[PDB]
């Protein structure tokens, strides 16, 4: 009787990359990198706000082309490339910081305060900001103008007796010509200073012809002030003031902003990318470096295969004529579909096959436990794509982003290589232990033929083979016959 | 007959560093850190432009001391420590951003435009910019001055009808005294506003006595504006305007800048460092953290050895008298020069040595494969060395670079240790596998003497030893003699 120990093999198999060999054929493998997106943004479980044709700053100021975004909350504000401004031309010095502040706040909650403007005409407007059939202005700003023929120096105050920060968004008007600074504001040169007990901002405006935009050659520079509890806002203006109508509530949370043209459809997904929502089961993704929510780490590799099975050594008709097969170290067994390791016997009663459940289950559980560890929640990050050229800060952000990508890609490559090598080693070790256990079970009743098979020198039926398989093999009831047939011709 | 299995050793071997011990001897190792440079910069395949005695901004503005750099293109601009300015004393607000912008553009290509400045005197100059025997100015700037006794409000425009971004470099002149201001620009205070449809820049010149530089106590503040296609540039000047004569073409590419004093010699190299060009075969380098082109990663470690061979255990005359030495368990073999593993036999016909080529080839292939994996293209990065003291952003850049260096050094240490340990454990495994194969071949006809040797209990000639070596050893034609000599005294 002969008992051969072998492992399974699949007809077709995957190719993985280990420490030494860059192409190792294994039975099964899994993809560790996500490179596909549905192209749509789910609205669960996060609050997604489609900005349509309005920027976050445009909704902050009160663009009349969209007042729907008034007093709204969001977890991710989605900016579309078709957005535009349809009001008085304006600019925001340090624009990105204000955008980040409003995005991270997450609430466009405007509360009006009782500002008193003595001696000036309120509710100014322009033909570039038509609110229907008449001339209007930003909803959250107040354009002050000379009342009668005098513009007094305005000195207004407002305390913060509450328990939250207040964001005051104000502005300074830069007229096109000196006829204007005088017609609107009497004084030839204005000045706007907004101060708190710890900081101040003073703006001396400008006179000059800017390019024609929506019929106005002037500009409006938008500034913001943060008032902490126990502080007081003081506004002193000689002229050229676009006063605030109130304050925006400021809160700290997980809110952020994103630029994408992807549609929004009803579904559930915890990871949002500009290309669309992607599943987060895989530890790595290769869709976009801009992510929101629980998202996989971005890598430069399109594919990365983790070895789930063992090495694949199939039958290729290399050797062995008319059957005549061998144990584990000749090839694998494509005919074993019950387990990873098994026995094949040829006794006087015939041939047969069986599977070893203990070693197969041990290998499977070890590989599954390794897989579980292999498979972060980032909400507000730095901007990663830029449409203009700025300089030092942009290069710094690009350098940081590239360094992070390179380090994470190296980590992913090293991790997958190490795991694949250890998987192969653990499978080979498991087969070695099975062979050793069979050898100690058989003792001097069998001999190793060098091809992964034991030649048993005593005749015993299928009950004997089952006893060897299950470990309940008594070598002392066969020692005399085995020794006689082994050492005495 | 005795057959012994052994592995080769070298008289002097390297000392490498693995997980277990920091000092373990290995027959052959390779250095993984490039710590030396040739001291010169190659001009291929990258287009290197030696700046000589001018900074990039000086060539941008057109200092008379090197109009050679007009309409120039580079892949890497080399800035020398001997660079100096020889024109009107000028300052560049936020100098680094403009320097990086021009360096990444890669071209000093100037296209003149038909600006019409009616009512002012053009082509102004100063004695600090001597263009030979006469007084000149920057070639790419136009110093406007009152014509007669009036300086009108200059309101000029220029659109973007092309498909590329235009870079307009202009300036504002801060005079030394009010007398000179009124003599040059009539108005007591000047005002320069340069605007596009989405941005603007206003400058109010201030008058003061700056330190005497090249005969003039005034200053020129240089500003830049980027005009995208479909945009227009409008310049409105009450006075104190250094007008632009045209625009610089803006390009996106792989150009950068570097500060180095190294010479440039005719050679080829894909990696450039301030200390010179270095080879890019090694994965790590310890020359400089500033690199251009395909360059190895900078690491803090001066040396890093990767084990190419296996443990080196030589003879040291400890045990074994009168040449009676044998086995791989005890030590290695210096007398083996044709293979890594092999056999030594002592039979009735004498002694002999041979090498087992299959295991040696397998080990060499595995080691070469793991070497190929160990063996990036960065062009424009952040500044790494600073000569001034600025603050926040400088510490931010230094922190980023330090973190990157530390992470990459840790990665290099871990990689070297892991690869060395795996190499040692795979060579030992190969030796053990060869021993196991020999034992399986020698079924019941030989026994292991523990020292790594097989005593064969039957006589056979050199053909028998060759048959054992090549795998074609039939144990059935020797069982009777071996058993008689082994088990029956």
């Amino acid at each position: 009787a002969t008992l051969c120990l072998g492992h399974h093999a699949v007809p077709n198999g995957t190719i993985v990359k280990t420490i030494t060999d860059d192409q190792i054929e294994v039975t099964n493998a899994t993809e560790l990198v996500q490179s596909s997106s549905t192209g749509k943004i789910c609205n669960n479980p996060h609050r997604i706000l489609d900005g349509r044709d309005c920027t976050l700053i445009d909704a902050l100021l009160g663009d009349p082309h969209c007042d729907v975004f008034q007093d709204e909350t969001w977890d991710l504000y989605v900016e579309r490339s078709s957005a535009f401004s349809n009001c008085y031309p304006y600019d925001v010095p340090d624009y990105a910081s204000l955008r980040s502040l409003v995005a991270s706040s997450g609430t466009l909650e405007f509360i009006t305060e009782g500002f008193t403007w003595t001696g000036v005409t309120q509710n100014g407007g322009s033909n570039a900001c038509k609110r229907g059939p008449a001339s209007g202005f930003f909803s959250r700003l107040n354009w002050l103008t000379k009342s009668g023929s005098a513009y007094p120096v305005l000195n207004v105050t407002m305390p913060n007796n509450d328990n939250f920060d207040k964001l005051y968004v104000w502005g300074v008007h830069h007229p096109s010509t000196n006829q204007e600074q005088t017609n609107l504001y009497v004084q030839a040169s204005g000045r706007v200073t907004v101060s708190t007990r710890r900081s101040q901002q003073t703006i001396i405006p400008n006179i000059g012809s800017r390019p024609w935009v929506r019929g106005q050659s002037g500009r409006i520079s938008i500034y913001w002030t943060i008032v902490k509890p126990g502080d007081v806002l003081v506004i002193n203006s000689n002229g050229n003031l676009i006063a605030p109508r109130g304050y925006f509530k400021m809160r700290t949370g997980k809110s952020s902003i994103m630029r994408s043209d992807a549609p929004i459809d009803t579904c559930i997904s915890e990871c949002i990318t500009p290309n669309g929502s992607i599943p987060n089961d895989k530890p790595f993704q290769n869709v976009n470096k801009i992510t929101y929510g629980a998202c996989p780490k971005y890598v430069k590799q399109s594919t990365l295969k983790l070895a789930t099975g063992m090495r694949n050594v199939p039958e290729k008709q290399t050797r062995g004529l008319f059957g005549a097969k061998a144990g584990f170290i000749e090839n694998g067994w494509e005919g074993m579909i019950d387990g990873w390791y098994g026995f094949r016997h040829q006794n006087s009663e015939g041939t047969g096959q069986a599977a070893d459940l203990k070693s197969t289950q041990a290998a499977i559980d070890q590989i599954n436990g390794k897989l579980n560890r292999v498979i972060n929640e980032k909400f507000h990050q730095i901007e990663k794509e830029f449409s203009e050229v700025e300089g030092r800060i942009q290069d710094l952000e690009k350098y940081v982003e590239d360094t992070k990508i390179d380090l994470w890609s190296y980590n992913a490559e090293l991790l997958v290589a190490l795991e694949n090598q250890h998987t192969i080693d653990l499978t080979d070790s498991e087969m070695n232990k099975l062979f050793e256990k069979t050898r100690r079970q058989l003792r001097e009743n069998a001999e190793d033929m060098g091809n992964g098979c034991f030649k048993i020198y005593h005749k015993c039926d299928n009950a004997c083979i089952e006893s060897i398989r299950n470990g309940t093999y008594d070598h002392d009831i066969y020692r005399d016959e085995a020794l006689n047939n082994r050492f005495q011709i | 007959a005795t057959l012994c299995l052994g592995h080769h050793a070298v008289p002097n071997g390297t000392i490498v560093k693995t997980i277990t011990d920091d000092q373990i001897e290995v027959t052959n190792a390779t250095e993984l850190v490039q710590s030396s440079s040739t001291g010169k910069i190659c001009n291929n395949p990258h287009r290197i432009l030696d700046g000589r005695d001018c900074t990039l901004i000086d060539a941008l503005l057109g200092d008379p001391h090197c109009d050679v750099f007009q309409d120039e293109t580079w892949d890497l601009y080399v800035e020398r420590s001997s660079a100096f300015s020889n024109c009107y004393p000028y300052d560049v607000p936020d100098y680094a951003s403009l320097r990086s912008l021009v360096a990444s553009s890669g071209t000093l290509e100037f296209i003149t435009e038909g600006f019409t400045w009616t009512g002012v005197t053009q082509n102004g100059g100063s004695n600090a910019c001597k263009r030979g025997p006469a007084s000149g100015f920057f070639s790419r700037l136009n110093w406007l001055t009152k014509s007669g006794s009036a300086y009108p409000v200059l309101n000029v425009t220029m659109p973007n009808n092309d498909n590329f971004d235009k870079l307009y470099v202009w300036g504002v002149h801060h005079p030394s005294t009010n007398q000179e201001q009124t003599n040059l620009y009539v108005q007591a205070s000047g005002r320069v506003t340069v605007s596009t449809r989405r941005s603007q820049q206003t400058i109010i010149p201030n008058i003061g006595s700056r330190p005497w530089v090249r005969g003039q106590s005034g200053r020129i503040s240089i500003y830049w504006t980027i005009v995208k296609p479909g945009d227009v540039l409008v310049i409105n000047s009450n006075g104190n305007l250094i007008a632009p004569r045209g625009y610089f073409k803006m390009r996106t590419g792989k150009s950068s800048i570097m500060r180095s004093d190294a010479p440039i010699d005719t050679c080829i190299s894909e990696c450039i460092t301030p200390n010179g060009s270095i080879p890019n075969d090694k994965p790590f380098q310890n020359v400089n953290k500033i690199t251009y082109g395909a360059c190895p990663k900078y690491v803090k470690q001066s040396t890093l050895k990767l084990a190419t061979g296996m443990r080196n255990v030589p003879e040291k005359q400890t045990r074994g008298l009168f040449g009676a030495k044998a086995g791989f368990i005890e030590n290695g073999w210096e007398g083996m020069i044709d293979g890594w593993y092999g056999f030594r036999h002592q039979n009735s016909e004498g002694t002999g040595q041979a090498a087992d080529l299959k295991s040696t080839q397998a080990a060499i292939d595995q080691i070469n494969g793991k070497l190929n994996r160990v063996i990036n293209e960065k062009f424009h990065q952040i500044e790494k060395e600073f000569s001034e003291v600025e603050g926040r952003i400088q510490d931010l850049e230094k922190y980023v670079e330090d973190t990157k260096i530390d992470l990459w050094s840790y990665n290099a240490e871990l990689l070297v240790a892991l690869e060395n340990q795996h190499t040692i454990d795979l060579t030992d495994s190969e030796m053990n596998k060869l021993f196991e194969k020999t034992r399986r071949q020698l079924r019941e006809n030989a026994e292991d003497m523990g020292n790594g040797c097989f005593k064969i209990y039957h006589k056979c000639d050199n053909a028998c030893i060759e048959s054992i070596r090549n795998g074609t050893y039939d144990h059935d034609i020797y069982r009777d003699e071996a058993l008689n000599n082994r088990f029956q005294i």
Partner: antibody
Amino acid sequence: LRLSCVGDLSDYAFSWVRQAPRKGLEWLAAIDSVSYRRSTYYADSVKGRFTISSDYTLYLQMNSLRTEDTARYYCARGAFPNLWGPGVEV
Amino acid sequence: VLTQTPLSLSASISCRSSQSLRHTDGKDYLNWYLQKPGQSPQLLIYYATTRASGVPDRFTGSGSGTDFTLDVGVYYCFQGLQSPPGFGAGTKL
């Protein structure tokens, strides 16, 4: 005589096949590998009165040949005739 | 013994065996070879299901037990489960 039966080592099994000009392929001989005692089998027609072959890849002659063995001989590799050679006319 | 039908073709070739060529391992012991005019026979299909690497995908064959089914040349079906292995008559296409 032999031919180029490669296009490595001797770990594989081998076979000798005969093709008459217009009679089709006929398997004659097969030599196993070392791992299975190199048990060699021969065709029932060539049986006994055969001409054995080996490797070091050629076949001998001067035997019970009855002028019927005039054909093209092919050296094949594997348990099955997987890799073939140009063959030699006889 | 193996019977190959049709003997002449003008795209399926059938090889039927008296004894089933399925082994206890679980693989059918049949190969399909192509002999081009004047050149050496080339492996097309091994184990009656698997396709040899490096051959055009135009060729596909399948079957079990006794029945197996499948460019100018002769097609041969070969068995290697019994002591006297042999090829078939050959289908000329």
